[PDB]
Write a protein that holds these residues in place. Sequence first.
Motif, PDB file in Angstrom:
ATOM      1  N   UNK A 118       0.812  -1.185   0.000  1.00 23.74           N
ATOM      2  CA  UNK A 118       0.000   0.000   0.000  1.00 23.74           C
ATOM      3  C   UNK A 118       0.861   1.255   0.000  1.00 23.74           C
ATOM      4  N   UNK A 119       1.969   1.161   0.747  1.00 21.30           N
ATOM      5  CA  UNK A 119       2.927   2.234   0.839  1.00 21.30           C
ATOM      6  C   UNK A 119       3.521   2.506  -0.529  1.00 21.30           C
ATOM      7  N   UNK A 120       4.021   1.473  -1.172  1.00 14.91           N
ATOM      8  CA  UNK A 120       4.600   1.698  -2.474  1.00 14.91           C
ATOM      9  C   UNK A 120       3.615   2.225  -3.488  1.00 14.91           C
ATOM     10  N   UNK A 129       5.307  -2.334  -5.970  1.00 12.59           N
ATOM     11  CA  UNK A 129       3.958  -2.721  -5.589  1.00 12.59           C
ATOM     12  C   UNK A 129       3.679  -4.080  -6.189  1.00 12.59           C
ATOM     13  N   UNK A 130       3.752  -4.152  -7.512  1.00 12.33           N
ATOM     14  CA  UNK A 130       3.479  -5.401  -8.215  1.00 12.33           C
ATOM     15  C   UNK A 130       4.111  -6.602  -7.525  1.00 12.33           C
ATOM     16  N   UNK A 131       5.410  -6.528  -7.259  1.00  7.08           N
ATOM     17  CA  UNK A 131       6.073  -7.651  -6.654  1.00  7.08           C
ATOM     18  C   UNK A 131       5.595  -8.040  -5.247  1.00  7.08           C
ATOM     19  N   UNK A 132       5.180  -7.084  -4.472  1.00  8.63           N
ATOM     20  CA  UNK A 132       4.742  -7.448  -3.121  1.00  8.63           C
ATOM     21  C   UNK A 132       3.383  -8.072  -3.160  1.00  8.63           C
ATOM     22  N   UNK A 133       2.493  -7.441  -3.928  1.00  6.88           N
ATOM     23  CA  UNK A 133       1.193  -7.977  -4.020  1.00  6.88           C
ATOM     24  C   UNK A 133       1.321  -9.450  -4.319  1.00  6.88           C
TER      25      UNK A 133
END
Length: 164
Positions: A118-120, A129-133
Amino acid sequence: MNIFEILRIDEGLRLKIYKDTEGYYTIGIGHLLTKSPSLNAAKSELDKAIGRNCNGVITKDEAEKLFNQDVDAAVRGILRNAKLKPVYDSLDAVRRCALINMVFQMGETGVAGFTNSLRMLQQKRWDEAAVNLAKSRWYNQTPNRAKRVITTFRTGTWDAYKNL
């Protein structure tokens, strides 16, 4: 691309009570009727939702009314949420729909717990973002949906839903 088109793509459309991937009775577009192994409770939950006696059967109209209430609750969810608000408030119209899509599926609180992600998103860092999700459970469980959504944020387009 509007929210209705996306979610029906994602959630599907069913006019009669049915068991979902988790074995839960549902109806329409992702409306969860009950988690109990019981058509009765399900049918009564449906009845309370619609307002008529449907006997486990609805029309496109009703499916639409429900859906409308469902997405509003999602949207009202994000707006009342302290972590979500700032995120939602800063994204663009395409990216915001993707946010609304996650809340719809997993609820205000489940999304809220994707803290870094959410932070990114805030920090306009799409690929981060993409990678964490992705490193999520959500992704493992409904990889095709997850990926659609994740690509919405990453790309900022409806690329993932135009050609299916």
